[PDB]
C-alpha cells in the first residue's frame, strides 16, 4: 500500500530553522508530484509547497507566506521529499503533512515555533473511587500535567488495554504548559485483582513514564 511518514517536527525558537522529511513507499515515487500541507486551529488546512515529478523537471511552487523562507526538495533515489524551513515564525506552528498528488497523506509531524521551554510531564494517578458504584463499573486514569510542546501519547498496560479508554485533548494552561487526562472504565470487581498502568510518552522531552494506578 501507499505509505508516507513525516519526521523532523519539533520545538524551535522564532527565527530558527528546521528540516522536515517524508519517507514514501508503495508507489513509483519519481512519477509522483508531492506537496506539503500544514494545519492549525486558527487557519485550518493550508497548502505550503509543491514539487513536480520529471514531467515538469521537479519545478517548485510555494505559498506566498513561506516563499523565500521554505525550500522543498526531493531525492528520487531515496524516495524522500524534504521541507527546509528557515526564519521560522510563530504563525508557522502547526501539523505538517506530506501528500502525493493530494491523494494520500502521511500521519503528520508537529512543528512548534515558540520561545517557551521544553518540559516533560508529571504523571499522577486518578485512583478509582472507594465508594462502590450501583452497577459494577469503576473509572480510573492518569493526569499528564505540565508539559511542552505537544504531543503526548498514552497507552494502558503496554497496549493490552484499549476497551473503554478515553484520552482527552490537551488543554493549554495559563502557564503555557499543556495538561491532559486519560481515563478507562473497568469492572469494580477487578480493582483488587487487576493491575492498571498508564504508559506515557513525551518524545519532545525524551520522557517515558509508567504509572501504576491503585485504589485508595
Amino acid at each position: 500500500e501507499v505509505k508516507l511518514e513525516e519526521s523532523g517536527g519539533g520545538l524551535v525558537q522564532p527565527g530558527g530553522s528546521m528540516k522536515l522529511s517524508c519517507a514514501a513507499s508503495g508507489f513509483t515515487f519519481s512519477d509522483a508530484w508531492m506537496d506539503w500541507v500544514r494545519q492549525s486551529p486558527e487557519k485550518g488546512l493550508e497548502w505550503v509547497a509543491e514539487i513536480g515529478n520529471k514531467g515538469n523537471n521537479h519545478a517548485t511552487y510555494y505559498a506566498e507566506s513561506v516563499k523565500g523562507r521554505f525550500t522543498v526538495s526531493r531525492d528520487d533515489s531515496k524516495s524522500r521529499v524534504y521541507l527546509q524551513m528557515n526564519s521560522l515564525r510563530v504563525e508557522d506552528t502547526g501539523t505538517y503533512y506530506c501528500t502525493t498528488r493530494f491523494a494520500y497523506w502521511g500521519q503528520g509531524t508537529l512543528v512548534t515555533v515558540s520561545a517557551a521551554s521544553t518540559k516533560g510531564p508529571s504523571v499522577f494517578p486518578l485512583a478509582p473511587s472507594s465508594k462502590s458504584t450501583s452497577g459494577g463499573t469503576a473509572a480510573l486514569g492518569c493526569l499528564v500535567k505540565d508539559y511542552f510542546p505537544e504531543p503526548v501519547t498514552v497507552s494502558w498496560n503496554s497496549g493490552a488495554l484499549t476497551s473503554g479508554v478515553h484520552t482527552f485533548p490537551a488543554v493549554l494552561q495559563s502557564s503555557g504548559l499543556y495538561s491532559l487526562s486519560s481515563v478507562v472504565t473497568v469492572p469494580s470487581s477487578s480493582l483488587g485483582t487487576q493491575t492498571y498502568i498508564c504508559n506515557v510518552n513525551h518524545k519532545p522531552s525524551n520522557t517515558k513514564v509508567d504509572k501504576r494506578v491503585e485504589p485508595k
Binding site: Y61, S181, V183
Partner: protein, 214 residues
C-alpha cells in the same frame, strides 16, 4: 488567490440520512476539486478528486458533483464512521487553496453521563498544586454544565474543560473538568463537589468527596 467557501460550517445528521455539503470557488476551477474527510487527531483522507472520481477504496456512498465554480459532496446513507470534518481543495491554479471545512456530527438518542470525581493524588500534593478532576463519560448531546463547589462556594475562573469528539462506536462525548488550586488552598477546605446538569438527567447530579477521607 481562489477563495473556497464551504457550507454549512457544521451540521448534525442521523444514521442512514442523505447528506450533501457544498464547496464554491471564486472562479471557474475546471473540476480540479478534491474532497477530504479528517477524523479527530488523524490526518485527512482524500475521498474524491477531479470533482467526482472516487479514490480507490473509498465507500460507494460517497459521490461528488458539480462543475465550474460550485461543487457538492453527497453521502447517500450516513454511517457512524462518516463523522468528522470535511474539506475541499482546488488545484486548478497556484496557490492551491482549501475550504474552511464542514463539521459533520451524528445525531443519536440522549445519553446521560456517568460522573466520577477524583481527588488530587498524594504524589501531586507534594508539589504544592492540587488538581481535582470531574469526569463525564459517554453522554449525548454535547451540551453539559459542570460547576465546582468548594465548601458550597461556587467556583469561577479556576477550572478548565476538555471534551472528546464523538466516539466512533457509539457517537457519544466524554468530558473532563479539572479544578486547579494551590495545595495550601486545597488543604484548608473540606467538601469538594462537581455538579453536572445534562438533559439526560432528570435533575443535576453531584459527585463529591471530603478531603482526607478514604
Amino acid at each position: 488567490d481562489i477563495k473556497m467557501t464551504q457550507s454549512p460550517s457544521s451540521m448534525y445528521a442521523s444514521l442512514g440520512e442523505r447528506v450533501t455539503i457544498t464547496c464554491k470557488a471564486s472562479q471557474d476551477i475546471n473540476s480540479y476539486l478534491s474532497w477530504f474527510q479528517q477524523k479527530p487527531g488523524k490526518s485527512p483522507k482524500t475521498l474524491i478528486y477531479r470533482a467526482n472520481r472516487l479514490v480507490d477504496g473509498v465507500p460507494s456512498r460517497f459521490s461528488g458533483s458539480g462543475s465550474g465554480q460550485d461543487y457538492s459532496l453527497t453521502i447517500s446513507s450516513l454511517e457512524y464512521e462518516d463523522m468528522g470534518i470535511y474539506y475541499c481543495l482546488q488545484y486548478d491554479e497556484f496557490p492551491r487553496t482549501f475550504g474552511g471545512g464542514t463539521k459533520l456530527e451524528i445525531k443519536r438518542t440522549v445519553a446521560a453521563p456517568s460522573v466520577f470525581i477524583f481527588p488530587p493524588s498524594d504524589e501531586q500534593l507534594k508539589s504544592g498544586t492540587a488538581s481535582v478532576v470531574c469526569l463525564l463519560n459517554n453522554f449525548y448531546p454535547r451540551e453539559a454544565k459542570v460547576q465546582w463547589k468548594v465548601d458550597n462556594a461556587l467556583q469561577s475562573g479556576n477550572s478548565q474543560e476538555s471534551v472528546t469528539e464523538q466516539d466512533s462506536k457509539d457517537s457519544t462525548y466524554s468530558l473532563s473538568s479539572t479544578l486547579t488550586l494551590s495545595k495550601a488552598d486545597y488543604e484548608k477546605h473540606k467538601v469538594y463537589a462537581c455538579e453536572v446538569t445534562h438533559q439526560g438527567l432528570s435533575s443535576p447530579v453531584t459527585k463529591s468527596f471530603n478531603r482526607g477521607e478514604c
